[PDB]
Swiss-Prot record, chain B:
Function: Component of the ribosome assembly machinery. Nuclear paralog of the ribosomal protein P0, it binds pre-60S subunits at an early stage of assembly in the nucleolus, and is replaced by P0 in cytoplasmic pre-60S subunits and mature 80S ribosomes.
Keywords: Cytoplasm, Nucleus, Ribonucleoprotein, Ribosomal protein
PANTHER family (UniProt xref): MRNA TURNOVER PROTEIN 4 HOMOLOG, MRNA TURNOVER PROTEIN 4 MRTO4
Record CDD domains: Ribosomal_P0_like
The name this protein goes by in its record: Large ribosomal subunit protein uL10
Gene Ontology cellular component terms for the protein in this record: cytoplasm; nucleolus; preribosome, large subunit precursor; ribosome
Length: 190, 245
RNA sequence: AACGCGACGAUAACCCGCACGUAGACGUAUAAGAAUAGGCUCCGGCCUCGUAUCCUAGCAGGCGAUUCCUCCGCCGGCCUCGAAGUGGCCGUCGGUAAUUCGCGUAUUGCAAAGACACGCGCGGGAUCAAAUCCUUUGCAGACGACUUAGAUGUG
RNA sequence: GGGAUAACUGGCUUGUGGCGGCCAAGCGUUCAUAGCGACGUCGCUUUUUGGAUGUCGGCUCUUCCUAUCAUACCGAAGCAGAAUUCGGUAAGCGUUGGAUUGUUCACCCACUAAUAGGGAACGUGGACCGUCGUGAGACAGGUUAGUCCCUACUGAUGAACUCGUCGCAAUGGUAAUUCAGCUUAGUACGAGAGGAACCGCUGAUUCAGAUAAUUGGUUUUUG
RNA sequence: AGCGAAUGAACUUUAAAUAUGUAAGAAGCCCUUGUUACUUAACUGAACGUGGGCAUUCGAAUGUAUCGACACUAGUGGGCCAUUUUUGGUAAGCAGAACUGGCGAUGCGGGAUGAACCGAACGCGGGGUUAAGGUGCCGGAGUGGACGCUCAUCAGACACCACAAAAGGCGUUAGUACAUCUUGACAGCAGGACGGUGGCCAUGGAAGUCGGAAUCCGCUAAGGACUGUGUAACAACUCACCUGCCGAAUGUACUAGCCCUGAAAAUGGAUGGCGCUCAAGCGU
RNA sequence: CAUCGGUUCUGGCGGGGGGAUAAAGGCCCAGGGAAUGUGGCUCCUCCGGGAGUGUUAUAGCCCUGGGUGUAAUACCCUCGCCGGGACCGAGGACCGCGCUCUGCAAGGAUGCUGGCGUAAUGGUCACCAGCGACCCGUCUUGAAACACGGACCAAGGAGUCAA
């Protein structure tokens, strides 16, 4: 239909500092640095109030207006992660063989490594490497639960998804063998 | 065009009410306006109204309406030009939020004497401040979550462990009994589901529901009356501070 | 790649005689990168636009002045350029309308065989440095082809 | 005996029957009734006690397709384990016999990881006539019908670019397969009978490329 | 067309289009008067003779590179394809007539190429202008202009059907018909989702939720003798429905474009190639 | 090269006519109306910006009738004038039709200037380049496609003569 104008709103809290060079948006807050490139979509970025980002499309189709809604929440998720943070509480359960989890932060490249042993008695060590920016700690409040924390929601969710996939049971009935590591709680740090 | 969600038709007997239910509620309220003497208005702000059937039974004399408020405002008559009786457009300025009408023939003092004396403990709705720190013990989880002593408590059903886990509790089952940590005890720390003074959101409200714990009080606030003989209104106590439009 | 390319080793300077001087020059002038729902910048401002910027006067461009330290070129010296390799700076020397003049240009008529100097090659001989044939070799061979060896030696 | 088509297919073929009835959105002679009519469902085949194949082959080899038998990967199934079953991506790599037969398939039996199916103008190594017959038949009756060139590629050479040494790599080909044993482990799982897998370790078949110390074979060294 | 004309394609005052037979003067017309070998009741017909008018509009249009009679002389006496009409038939092909046209004895421009398509017919040359077809490059000529549509895991490409369906498409655009909507639309969140009634049969059990039948009523704002999950039965969760918060247009079925799928084998290959994506595709 | 003739291509200019004597439009005159509501006024998170009311105020718009007005312009048709380029020069005393008449553009190119003999201009061969382009005869057939003949050259070689 070639809509002439469509706009959207991203509010920004008081303790933030956002900067958009061309489409490279960077959000600086209390928790740290976040940055991402959005040159793949035609968005006009403006400031319309004291703490409001404006994002507009001119002479766009339905898919051009719908592209403004997905980039509204991605930038807002960057605002949330640099203010409040993201927390994923995964829990590993077992029937007979007790699954062992060890987390060590590697000196070079600064990435946590989560290594997994004794998954239904397999002798192979399962070393999964976290994304740069997410921290993994063994929870002491509850038994057999892992906590992944970070600012980038995409990084913490992919690191959690990588752990679930690597401990997947093969060639065995999934109604009988319930061993694995699963995401349980999914929210914020604060 | 295309790329749209498919509406799930419901193969079920009860269908949409629509315009016929609008005029029927209009008809019953109009037909009860000249029958009774006093028109009471009450508010139930953020509480479950499942005990409103109980005030139907005890007040078998009265006639009490609680539906859509805009319909009840148009039924009484919002403007002074269009209304069923004098002072009825003062009540339409009262009807703002979750409110209902109450037509009665008895002494007005006896009604809010009852409604001041009504008190029944209710499950908390989402948004209220929690008055106690309730907490399931660290061991095996029972039906009431440690509210009653465990020596007189029944263990929780195994079918609820899907919903307990989905609502946030880190619970397991060993040997068919749902347990938080170890079956014997200790091991874990426990799950505190609400704090002192915390606003209760949706999930811990549902947790207090299935654990049969009530953290709120059901009381209905009377707002005011209009008399058929007198023709005017008096604000009881509630509408002095309650937002009204 | 036997009509793809690179690095390296060693070569062919003499003397005698003789055959000829553009798959398209004519100012054949111009280096940021990057974005294109942005960018450049003297930090003043600027961007549709290369319709721009350098160079361009002089017998096909003479001779001598007045006058000028600007531009061009050659050698060095020191440094830089390697994707299929060049420019910078300094010094010498040669040239040089930024200003103003003087003496030539013609009757080739309105457009369409002289002398000197320098290269590219041919035909002889003499001086190099190699290769092939030759003899041996058998790590090789249908035949060619290939691996060796033969000038004084560890043959 | 006369007449007529020179000849077949070339967006052909494959997995789901036919007949009658009921229902039926639409279109139509003027409208869902002049009527055409799918998907389903009903009646028949079809129900209440568990052999088929004519000419052909047979073997090797090349190459291709996938409509996949095995090997790799996943999705689903009361899939506990083990063994499977159905489906999907997949042609990288491999792909039998025996009994019986005119010959094949079906079935049965054995081996193996399995021993799938196809394509390559369906790959490369009589024809009358005459004679005698006529209820049918023939003929020691006849004559006649009826195909050594060029070039691609590969290997070894090769003129010219001065000879020789050390290189670069455009392009073309391309390679590895399958099974087993030890440990995991008599462990997960299981009432029992039974019974895995990942990591690690060691062999074997096929295939490819080399080599002659040793062990066989061979003797124009005629010792 | 009408049947406010009659009557009822077989109705008609009138009358198509469209092909297709026959006439449109002087070599012609009419009648008068006579004969005959023909015929008739009879110049009633046929023939032979008689009379007239108009020859400077002699009886529509257009064209007219002459026509006719006689005699003589060569070569020929096959068909193939298409349009339209028409007869028969098939599951579909197909077979046979009639007219016309093309090719046969025909060169040229175009459709990349070509028996049957489109344009156009021919001495030797110079100049100009077109047709069919084209103007991104191969290739002469537009990376021409205006408004849209389309992204295809081998799109489509200019003058054409079958597979193919009442087919599948959470692709995209335009439109039609119904319905809801500030009396707060659809979507969401917060809640209610009751009572007779663990309704009647069956029965270890079966309370809405393994089955058979019935499927009623009070409160209502509404709530099914129940949409699913669940239990040995319970319980609990859920859906239908209803209320509060937000606030403006929705949502069902069809239709028409373009696009995907709508079946494919086997040497490596084809809109002619390159390649093309606000086209170098498609419609005007 | 100048002045001409024939054909042709392509630029620019001056008029005339017609349509609703264009429709519009500018400036006036008169009546009417509205909001995508001007100023004002009220509410109004005050460099600023929204909501409502109300018909021209400190902006303007629409509709109708009239004047300037036989307005201009577009479009269609038409009478002419001037420039730029290409190809061509047939014929050979006069005659004809004319005209702007001491001769002209009127039944077909003259005038002026230059160049050309150790080469103006041609020929043949070889080769390169762009575009084009099946191997002839015979025979069959609607046609192609088959089929027969062709190693090459010279000489001979086939509708004749009588009644």
């Amino acid at each position: 239909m070639r809509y002439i104008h469509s706009e959207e709103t991203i509010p920004v809290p008081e303790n933030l500092k956002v900067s958009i060079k061309s489409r490279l948006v960077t959000v600086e807050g209390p928790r740290g640095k976040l940055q991402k490139d959005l040159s793949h979509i035609a968005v006009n970025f403006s400031v319309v109030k004291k703490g409001v980002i404006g994002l507009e499309i001119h002479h766009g189709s339905r898919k051009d207006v719908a592209a403004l809604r997905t980039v509204r929440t991605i930038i807002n998720n960057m605002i949330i992660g640099v203010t409040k943070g993201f927390k994923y509480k995964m829990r590993y359960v077992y029937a007979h063989f007790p699954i062992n989890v060890n987390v060590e932060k590697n000196a070079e490249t600064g990435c946590y490594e989560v290594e997994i042993r004794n998954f239904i008695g397999e002798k192979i060590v399962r070393k999964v490497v976290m994304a740069p920016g997410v921290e993994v700690e063994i929870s002491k409040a509850q038994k057999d639960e892992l906590i992944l924390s970070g600012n980038s929601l995409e990084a913490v969710s992919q690191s959690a998804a990588d752990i679930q996939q690597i401990c997947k049971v093969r060639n065995k009935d999934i109604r009988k063998f319930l061993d694995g590591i699963y995401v349980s709680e999914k929210g914020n740090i604060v | 065009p295309k790329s749209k969600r498919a509406r799930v038709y419901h193969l079920i007997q009860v269908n949409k009410k629509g315009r016929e239910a609008k005029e029927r509620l209009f008809s019953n309220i109009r037909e009860t306006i000249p029958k009774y003497q006093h028109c009471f208005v009450f508010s139930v702000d953020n509480m479950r109204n499942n005990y409103l059937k109980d005030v139907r039974h005890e007040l078998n004399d009265c006639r009490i309406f609680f539906g859509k408020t805009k319909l009840m405002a148009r039924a009484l008559g919002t403007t002074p030009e269009e209304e069923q009786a004098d002072g009825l457009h003062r009540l339409t300025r009262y009807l703002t939020g979750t409110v209902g009408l109450l037509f009665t023939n008895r002494d007005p003092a006896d009604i809010e004497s009852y409604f001041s004396n009504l008190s029944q403990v209710d499950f908390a709705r989402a948004g209220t401040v929690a008055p106690r720190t309730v907490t399931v013990p660290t061991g095996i989880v029972y039906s009431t979550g440690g509210e009653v002593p465990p020596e007189h408590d029944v263990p929780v059903s195994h079918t609820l462990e899907p919903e307990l886990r989905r609502l946030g509790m880190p619970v397991r089952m060993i040997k068919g009994k749902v347990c938080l940590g170890d079956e014997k005890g200790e091991a874990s720390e426990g799950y505190t589901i609400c704090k002192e003074g915390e606003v209760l959101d949706s999930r811990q409200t549902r947790l207090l529901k299935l654990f049969s714990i009530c953290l709120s009080e059901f009381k209905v606030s009377l707002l005011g009356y209009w008399n058929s003989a007198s023709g005017e209104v008096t604000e009881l106590e509630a509408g002095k501070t309650r937002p009204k439009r």
